[PDB]
Symmetry: D2
Subunit: 323 residues, 4 copies
Amino acid sequence: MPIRIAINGTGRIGLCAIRVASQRKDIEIVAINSTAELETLLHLIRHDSVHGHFEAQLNADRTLNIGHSKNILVLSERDINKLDFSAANAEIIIECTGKFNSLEASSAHLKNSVKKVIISAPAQNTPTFVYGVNHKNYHNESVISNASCTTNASAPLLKILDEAFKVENALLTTIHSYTNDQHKDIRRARAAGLNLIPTSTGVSKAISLVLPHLGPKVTGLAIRVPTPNVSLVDLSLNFKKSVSKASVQHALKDACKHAFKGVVSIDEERLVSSDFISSPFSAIVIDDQIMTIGEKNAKVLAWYDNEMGYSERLIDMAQYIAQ
Amino acid sequence: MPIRIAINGTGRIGLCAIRVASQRKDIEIVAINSTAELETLLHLIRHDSVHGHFEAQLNADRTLNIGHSKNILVLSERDINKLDFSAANAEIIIECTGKFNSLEASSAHLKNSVKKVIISAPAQNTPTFVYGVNHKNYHNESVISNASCTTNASAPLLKILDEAFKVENALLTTIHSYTNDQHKDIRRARAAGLNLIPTSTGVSKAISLVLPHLGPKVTGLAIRVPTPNVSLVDLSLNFKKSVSKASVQHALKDACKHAFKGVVSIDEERLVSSDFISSPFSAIVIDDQIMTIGEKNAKVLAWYDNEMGYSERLIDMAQYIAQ
Amino acid sequence: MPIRIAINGTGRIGLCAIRVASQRKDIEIVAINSTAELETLLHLIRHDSVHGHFEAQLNADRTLNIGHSKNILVLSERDINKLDFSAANAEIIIECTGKFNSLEASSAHLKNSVKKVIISAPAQNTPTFVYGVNHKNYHNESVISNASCTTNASAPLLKILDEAFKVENALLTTIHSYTNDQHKDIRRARAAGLNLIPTSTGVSKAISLVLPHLGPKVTGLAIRVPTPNVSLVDLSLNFKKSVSKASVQHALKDACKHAFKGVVSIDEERLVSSDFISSPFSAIVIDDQIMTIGEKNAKVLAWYDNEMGYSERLIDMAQYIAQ
Amino acid sequence: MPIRIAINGTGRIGLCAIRVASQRKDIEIVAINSTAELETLLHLIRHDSVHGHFEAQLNADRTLNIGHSKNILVLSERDINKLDFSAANAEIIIECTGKFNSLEASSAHLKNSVKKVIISAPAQNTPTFVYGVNHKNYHNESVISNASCTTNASAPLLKILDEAFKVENALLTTIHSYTNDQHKDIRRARAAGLNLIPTSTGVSKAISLVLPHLGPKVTGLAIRVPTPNVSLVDLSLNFKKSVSKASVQHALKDACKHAFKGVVSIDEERLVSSDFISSPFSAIVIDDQIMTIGEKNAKVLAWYDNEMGYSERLIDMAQYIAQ
């Protein structure tokens, strides 16, 4: 029987999760909770400025029909304590509202038929997993976090490169595309659309949750830029083992054939950011721009769609934790 | 007597050089050569989408009157061999067309009253100087290059940090704003306005010209982004001496008080890119985003206006080489 | 004695109103109410991505000192019923929060020393005035609306052209720049940053409030575009009197010399949108693009900064209603 | 036998024409002339920042294989007098370089196997046709123009509305998206990427070529905006017959069912500009934003992709003139 999931929240990540989940034969979306009116929700599923058009229909009984999910109940309840996914017999909640990003808050979902919650964001006090990095450490936790799009891109690369060459230290800069991004930090009060905006983002702590040995050896920051969706991570690494451009390229390519198949990819075609809109990978390595200096240092860049790679991992994690 | 300069070319750098030079009492712009009609040239001097409005007038005899340069002869001759700055008695040519970026090509200017040429770009076979880095090595060369805006930003920082801590290696990434940017590299055939575009840029060779000891120890790349003017350089460095965030901050601040006064600045106000439009500095360090990891590694970011800092250095170099 | 005003709300319009009011010797800003911390508010006054840097200081007693307003009390009270501008003896409130855009809601300000409220937006059930159009009809109303930036641009032009040629009908399209814009209309749910977005905006009703005879003769719409601040209105008019391009140009120019001096301007210099960032005019006519067809029809375009023209009118209206 | 065409020039319109023609079973692309290297041309066919990825292969003999065109000879000859499409037996040239936009210049193609030329731009002294408007007036001319994307959008609407209601006069404003746009007009010297730019465009003359009775009754202008591809035309019309919003809607809808089937479409779904990227229609009417005022005036808006609608018409015209 397909895994019965419900999506809570229909911002960008929730909408992408709907699209992704609808294409998986081992998933049934049984319910969506949205603040939008039904026809607005249908509109936003069908039409997207970056991801294009998508087929979705309304059934006669005003459930939705999308891909393999032919009978999706639509709810509109803001209060998590009143919200009741029981009529749809949901087993896993994908928590995409941004309002309950903690263990205590999202635990309010655990009632009736619901067994598990995956939070689509970093979350306070919450066991955190990145698919391909530490997801096999999962041990039946009922509320988990899928981390951030940034960590989903950088943690796979760090793991691959540490296994090959042994990371001594690394500095990460994320060029974070935020046109579609819907703090004690004064720069967050300034116009996203007109500016490059450097931001601290808790890189060391994030990495520590999924790669505990590396957390203390890495740090970095983000530069928010006014383009949509496709972001880049730039890792500057110092290794124990000597490296060349070729050896770094070969280590990354080998990983994509094996342990990170379907999660990390290599671009050998010299493409640009817009070519990776809607890419399902967590990271796409820019093969020709790998460089080394001295014996022990390298720079590695990788693209990612900050919605679609993440959302593909979200649903991968739902299938995994359902077993 | 003020130094008699002529500006060849009225693209973005030539126009910025006009504006800069007009405000210096020790400079007289005696001539401008432009492919534009006279009233078009006047328009483009007065009105700029990023640098705002500027006072300029046309004299009765149809010379221009701008700041301290009250009698600017306007020429329109494409052929360097026919071009004759003699009627204006020009001594130094600021070569801003992009058509003669070599020692052999720009040497065609050396005739009549002209003694020296400064090329506003990297140039083949041409002695290269960055103000504050190696300009005191100047030894009466008649044709020189002022390098690139990128090297003008990164070379001062490398020099400061090497003097303080000894650079073992460094990796540089420039986030290059190219909305106002008027190769064997296929990515250059793609839409600048819609994409992040990674590009090789010959970092090691560029640094080697002005900091020969460091050239072999540094490399990097650029990511072209569709914002105007204000760029960022991100340096990831490994040092011989142990560093902290504080010690790096103090080394940079001390340099701006002394050896790099008027060339490098520090931002302690947590500003964003648009705040540095039209800045005269080669680099403005982002003080709060300096970070270290391990004992020996640091990341330093700095802003620059890719036209105005460079153009202020261009005119600084003209005053210097005139002695 | 200068007129004692307080600004409620420090979004874009409130910040622009602060800057404007600070430069008027007949105004004293006595208080600002803001949800921001004091140092954040100071930052946002001093630094603006589109309007540039502005001088502001903090006094020893932690009032603000800006231009002619040397002792500005800073409050932070969200609840209009608890908010008390009495300590600063404010007489007029400039209501810029967007939360009280009705006669009933903004009437909660009328207590203690406060005599009048000007709402910086269209407001339900509220007497509405556009400076230069109908402000001389003011008759001591204690709560008024300054309409919208769009109506402030279009209503002056309609008035001028109706007086000259007699408007039979007109169609208005506003190209509304919304990068800095902080409904039953599904298009409002789509990405402002990536799209041209056509929107109904109640043109006929808006015009009817300030030009009652014309309201029934005009309609139109807006197209929201992802550029900042500088908008354009495009009016297509059918007149009773025959017109030429020249006669329309002359009617507009004459009005700017007389009845609309300081409110409407003419651009004879063939400028582009960025040249009018921070312009104080309600509308700047694009003289060379006026056209006619047939005997009776014309098209007239005009620029405006959707923050600064409006905010200059807001303070003009405060001075006027204070008498 | 399929019609043998060759595409001269591989800018945006040439590349779109390749993609379009490759999907038509009654067309064979026999040759492409490009200044690009072969692998660069292949890259630009396969990867597009706005139109996405497209399947194309290189055959063993280094012809291209795209859709129904399995044997495309690739040439690289800049000189029209040396260029020889004979080896590929081309019958119709689609002239997309922008270098030969006149009857005299493009007549240099008429040699060897070539019978006809279609110029993908307005062209001096050249018979001009818009598909659906006047293409049935074609009478075996050997060199023709397909006009501009703007005229392809506006002329169909003018024809429909004139037939229904009789146009007395009209004013047209085109919001022309020019991020992907690769004069005596000083505004053309300013930064396209940062500005709204009003431009005269010879509307009356353009319309006169395809709708001679209407040319004298219409005029207008363009406003160039920094978004990609999807443009809007805004027509303000005065009619002899009385109109309502409903009657205008019905006239446009009826035309799309009949005389303009496949050329004009209606949007009843309240979509935004990005939803029409790569649309094949010359114009897509914005049904809900049609408005009238008085008895005789209306405003009609319509979207178009400024590359793809035009390129679909270009190939439609090639099939038509081949008969």
